[PDB]
Every structure is written in C-alpha cells, then in structure tokens.
Design a protein around this ligand. Structure first.
Ligand SMILES: [Mg+2]
Ligand SMILES: [Mg+2]
Lengths: 62, 279, 73, 67, 64, 62, 64, 73, 67
C-alpha cells in the first residue's frame, strides 16, 4: 500500500515546513532577547547612577 | 528446591519439525498425603500458547519417569524466535492442579546439529503490576498568587479497554481535601491511540496556607458513548502522597515560578481511593 | 541469479524494516525534545511576564520620581 | 510485484527516513536555541530586578528630599 | 508477509507520532509568535524607561 | 479557512512529486528510443546488404 | 467578504483541476512505464534480428 | 498610519485574488498540455505496436531464410 | 484577525502560485519531450519498414534459389 507510505511522507514534509519556520522565528527571538539584554544592562546602570544622585539630593534638600 | 528435570531437544530438518522429549524428573517436593505427589508435565511452545502437550499422570512418585515425545510442526526460520516451556504440575482429583515448577528455554541459545539432552533445575512459576501504563504532566505553583498550573502532557503504554483495538483515553482531574472532591476538570478525547498527546493546561486557586493540605488526583479513563465510562488508571500527588509523586510535589514546591514535568505510574483506583480516605 | 535475487528481495525487506525501526526511534527523540522545548517555553514565558511587571513598576516609580523632581524645581 | 517494486519501496522508505532525520535535527536545534535563550532571559531578569531595586531606593530618597 | 506487516505497524505508529509532532509544532510556533510580540512590548517599555531615567538623572544632577 | 489552502497545497506538492518522476522516466524513454533508432538504422543497413547478397545467390543457384 | 469568497471559489476550482491533474499524471506515468517495458522488448528483438541477419549475411556471402 | 493600513489590507486581498486567477490560468494550460501529452502517448504507442509486429515479421522471415540457407549448404 | 493573518495568508497563497507554476512548467516539458521522442519514433518506424521490405525480398530470392 503505497498510499500510506506517500501520505506519511506528506505529513513529514508538512511538519518539516512548520518546524523550519518555527526555527527561524526562534532565531528572531534570540536577536530580540540579545538586544533586550543589552538594553537591560544599560537600564540598570542608569538606575544605579540615578540612585546615587538621588542619595546626594536627599542628603542635600532634607 | 522442588527438584531437577531431564529433557531432550533436537530438530528434524527432513520433516521440518521440532522433537521435544520429556525424559524424567528428580527430587520433586511432596505436596500430597502419602509423602509423594502425583506429577505430570505440561509442555508447549513458549511463543504462542497453542496446542499445549500434556504427559500421562504418574501416581505417587517424587522421581517420575515419562520417557515421552512431542512434535512441534514449526519451520526452522520461525523457530529461532520461539521458546519452549516445560512446567511440572501436581495432579489432585478434587481441586485445582497446583504447579510444582516451570522451565523456559530460548531457541536462540539452543544449538541444533547434535542431539541435545540435559538436566535443568526447576524454578517457581511467576504469579508484576497489570496496568503498565504511565502519565506525564507538569506542575507549577507560585506562592504569591496561589496559582496551581497542572498541564497534562501525555500518556503512554495504556491498558486496552476496547475489544480488539486501542483505547479512547481522556484525563479527568480532581482536587480533593478531607475526602471531598472540590474541582472537576477534563481534557479532549483522543480516539484510537496507544499514546495520547494532549498538552492541555489547567489552573487552580490554592492559597499558600493550605498548600500542605491539598490533594491532586489525575485519572486516565476510557470513553465509550453508551453506558458507564470505565477507568484505566489514576495517581495522586500532594497530601499523604508517597514515591516519585511526593518527589515531584517537593520539586514543584522547591522550584516556584517554574513548571516541572514528570512521569508517573498508574495505580488501581481502589488502593488510591483507599489512600485518599485517610485522615 | 535466481537465488541471489530472492535473497536480494528478502534483504531489501529486512533493510526497510530496520529502517522503520530507526524512524520510530528518531520520532521518539523528536517527541521528547519537543516536550522539553514546550516546558522551557512555559518557564521562560512566566519569566517574561515577571519582566513585564518589573517594567511597569519601574515606569510608575519613575513617574513618581518625575513628580517629586517637578515639585522640587 | 517484482524487484522494481521492492526497490522503489525501499527507496521511498529511505527517503522517509531522511526526512524524519531532518525533522529530528530541527527539533534538537529548537530545544538547544530555546535553552540558551533561556539563560539569556535569566540574566535579563537579573539586571531588571537590580534596576527595580535601585529605582525604588532612588524614588524613596527623592520623595523624602522634596518634603 | 510477517516481515511486511511488522513494518506496516511501524509505519502506522510513525504516522501517529508524526501527527502529534505536527500539533506540537503548531503550538510551539504560535506561542513563539505571541512571546515575540510580548518581547517587542518589553523593549518598547524598556526604552521608554531608559529615556525616562536618563532625563530624570540629568535633571536631578542639574540641581547639584 | 487555512485548512483548504494547506490541503490544496498538499495536493499540488503531491502532483509535483508525481510529475518529476514521470519526467525522469520520460528521459529514460528518450535514451531507450535513441539507442533503438541507432539499432534500427544498423538493422536496415544489414538488411539491404543481405538483400543484395541474396540477389546474387538467387542469380547464382537458379 | 465578496473579495474573499470570490477567491474562495477560485481556490475550489483550482483544487478540482489539481485533482484531475493528479489522475492524469498517474495514467501518464503508468503508461510511460509500460511503454518503456515494451521498448525494452523491442530492443531485445531488434538485437536478436541484428545478430540473425549478420550471421545469415556472412553465411550467404560465404557461398559466393 | 491607519488609512495606509486598511488600504494595505485591501491591497493584499486584491493581490491574492488576481494571484488565484493566475493559478486558474496556469492549471488550465497544464490541463491542456497534459491532454495533448496523453494523445501523443496513444499515437506513439500504436506506432510502437506496429514496430513490434515489424520485428516479429522480420524474425520469422529470417528464420525461413536460415532454413533455406541450411537446406542449400 | 489582523495584518499578520492577512500577510501569512498572502504568503502561503504566493507559495501555492509558485508550486502551481512549477507543476505547469513540468507539464510543458513533458509535452515537449514526448513530442520530440514522437519524431524519433517516426524515423525508427521508417527504418524498420525499410528493413522489413529488404528482408522480405531477400527471403524470396533465397527461397527461389535453393529449389
Ligand atoms: Mg493428588
Ligand atoms: Mg473506547
């Protein structure tokens, strides 16, 4: 019964076509996550600086 | 401890048939009144239990001599993956004939070409768990919001429930406390499958102050339209749980804001419900 | 020629058989890899949610700080 | 049938095995990437929580400073 | 025919498993998409707060 | 309804997989036909030669 | 929705035509195979007669 | 942004539509090409049959010629 | 839906059009090859019929020669 063989083959091909797209989307996710990582590091750096300045200002105007 | 068994084995290539000879047995334990049992040996091909051969019943001897022969019309190609079973039975006129011993011989260990004939020690026949099915799911609990996320992933090697075919499994989840069934959930019904895949998430409202007093009951059942729907297996995790279940629970607790997936072995509903009626 | 032919046919049969067995093993590995992948997706998802709540909190706090600095100036 | 039918059967079957194998490798790579990205998210959440702490303390200080 | 049937069973199991793999791939991809949208949101908010905190820090150090 | 789109797509893929094989088989047919052409030319050449020799032999033994 | 439905009808017709194309491709390929077997037969017979006529011509010119 | 977005959507709709029309045309050409292909296959098939009958006739004739040459020698 | 759904729809549709086009080109090549091979068969049958004539006349001549 070649019908089942070829049908299963078509299933496999379909799932492959799904998975490669999924993989590319995952790569895009890796890019976005990397940039978010850099942005977060910069964010916490600025946060610490602003915290220090806030300490100075509290020790000034109170 | 029952005794030994002398038998003969060889293959006739001219007729393409297996020649199994039952020579005798020795030092058999006595189970009857007179101090001696009434032994008889049942011999059949191990692979398929069809057309089993039985010897004549010898009266009151712990060293019976049968010297009988049996022929299994089996090709030589099929023979290699076929095993031989020789079990010694005790005859009783007014009750079930108790099995004295048994012996299994793999046909891949057997060497044909020279006529084989040997003594082998008898062993006690096997009476393991019947279900042999498993269910895998993930547990996630974050203590702050009190959310319990039970994601039914997938079951495997489930017991057949339908006649001459696979089963129609579905997962029912109960949440119990002090013997009472609070919440009721279920999944989609996957039809005709040996290994059902669901990947379905459920959430429950469980406070942090009662986390050590809750029961999570996962049940895999079979679905027929007509009549009562039977049950394949069930396992429970949480309060009064033991084994890998309590382990998975403790992993859920030790790892918050994170889901831990694990497999579990299905138990009979009687014992489980008996455990849930405790305290 | 004939014997070698029959043996060839049976050979191809066996080869195809063990091939299908290899397929079963491969789709099993694929299956499990997929499952653990989904698990990772759930975990990282909840982590992303916590990140979002973090961002919201930061926004509100800095809004208040902006208010105080505008009240000081 | 014949040897042609068996040969074509065998060929298409091998083709199926190779497609299956590619699918497999794709799933493996999937799990891999998702894991590494998971570690990335770990350190992101770390930096974010630190940032939250710093911001909170700063806000407290300014809030006490203005009044 | 036993050789052939055995193989047939194998191919059927492979078929079922392949179907399940399809479903899993769909769920996977979909959730990946949604999470990508969420990440976009996160970077928008994070850049917003980055600007917020830079301007706020400058204004704060201005009064020093 | 993406089901119909993807189903039609699968149909197209199947028919493609049929047709490429058909095309290769056609190429094989082209080979066989070419060789048959050469063989036929040689055949008719030998036929004419044998016809001539047969004419000589008839004009000899009759 | 008219835009969408119109397109839907198109896709249905394309589906039917594709099915017919499948059937045609099957008949095509099958008959191509059978004709290939026949061509093999033809070349066998043609080589046979080639040898026949070469040997016969040699034997005929031998008696001259 | 919004107007351009709606217009973009309708644009994609039209594009997909005319695309499907192109598909219909293409599968029509394919259809006809296939038909005439089959016709050619029938014709050439009958021609091959005539070729086979030719070969058979040649074989029998040369068998007779072989007989006469063996009767002459 | 949204623009994502419409975009993916459009993409898969274009994919379908390209697959269709490849199918088309395959059919065209098919018809072409079959035609050329048809001409080849024409000349084959020509040579064969000529061969048949020659063989027939030869056989007649030898048959009259032996007796
Ligand atoms: Mg007794
Ligand atoms: Mg059922």
């Amino acid at each position: 019964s070649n019908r089942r063989l070829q049908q299963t083959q078509a299933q496999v091909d379909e799932v492959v076509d799904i998975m490669r797209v999924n993989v590319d989307k995952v790569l895009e996710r890796d890019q976005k996550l990397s940039e978010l990582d850099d942005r977060a590091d910069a964010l916490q750096a600025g946060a610490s600086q602003f915290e220090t300045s806030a300490a100075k200002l509290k020790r000034k105007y109170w | 401890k029952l005794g030994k068994l002398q038998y003969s084995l060889d293959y006739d290539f001219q007729n393409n048939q297996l020649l199994v000879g039952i020579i005798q047995a020795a030092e058999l334990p006595a189970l009857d009144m007179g101090g001696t049992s009434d032994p008889y040996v049942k011999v059949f091909l191990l692979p398929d239990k069809k057309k089993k051969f039985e010897t004549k019943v010898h009266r009151k001897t712990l060293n019976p001599v049968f010297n009988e022969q049996f022929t299994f019309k089996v090709p030589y190609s099929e023979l290699g993956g076929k095993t031989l079973v020789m079990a010694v039975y005790d005859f009783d006129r007014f009750s079930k004939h108790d099995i004295i011993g048994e012996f299994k011989v793999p046909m891949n260990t057997v060497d044909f070409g020279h006529v084989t004939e040997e003594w082998r020690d008898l062993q006690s026949a096997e009476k393991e768990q019947e279900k042999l099915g498993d269910i895998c799911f993930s547990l996630r609990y974050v203590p702050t919001a009190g959310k319990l996320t039970v994601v039914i992933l997938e079951a495997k090697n489930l017991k057949k429930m339908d006649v001459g075919g696979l089963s129609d499994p579905y997962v029912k989840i109960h949440l119990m406390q002090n013997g009472k069934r609070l919440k009721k959930k279920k999944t989609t019904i996957k039809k005709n499958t040996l290994n059902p895949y669901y990947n379905e998430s459920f959430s429950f409202e469980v406070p942090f102050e009662q986390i050590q007093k809750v029961q999570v009951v996962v049940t895999v059942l079979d679905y027929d339209k007509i009549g009562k729907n039977d049950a394949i297996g069930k396992v429970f995790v949480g309060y009064n749980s033991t084994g890998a279940e309590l382990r998975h629970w403790s992993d859920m607790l030790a790892n918050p804001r994170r889901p831990i997936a694990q497999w579990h072995t299905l138990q009979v509903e009687e014992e489980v419900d008996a455990m849930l009626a405790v305290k | 020629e004939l014997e070698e032919m029959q043996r060839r046919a049976d050979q191809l049969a066996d080869e195809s058989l063990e091939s299908t067995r290899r397929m079963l093993q491969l789709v099993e590995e694929s299956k499990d890899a997929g499952i653990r992948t989904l698990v990772m997706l759930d975990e990282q998802g909840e982590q992303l949610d916590r990140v979002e709540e973090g961002m919201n909190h930061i926004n509100q706090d800095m809004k208040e700080a902006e208010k105080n600095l505008k009240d000081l100036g | 049938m014949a040897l042609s039918e068996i040969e074509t059967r065998h060929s298409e079957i091998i083709k199926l095995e190779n497609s299956i194998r590619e699918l497999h490798d794709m799933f493996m790579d999937m799990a891999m990437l998702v894991e590494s990205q998971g570690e990335m998210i770990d350190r992101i959440e770390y930096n974010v929580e630190h940032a939250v702490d710093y911001v909170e303390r700063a806000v407290s200080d300014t809030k006490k400073a203005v009044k | 025919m036993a050789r052939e049937n055995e193989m047939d069973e194998n191919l059927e199991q492979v078929s079922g498993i392949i179907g399940n793999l399809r479903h899993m791939a769909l769920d996977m991809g979909n959730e990946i998409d949604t999470q990508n949208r969420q990440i976009d949101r996160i970077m928008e908010k994070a850049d917003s707060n980055k600007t917020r905190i830079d301007e706020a820090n400058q204004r704060a150090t201005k009064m020093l």
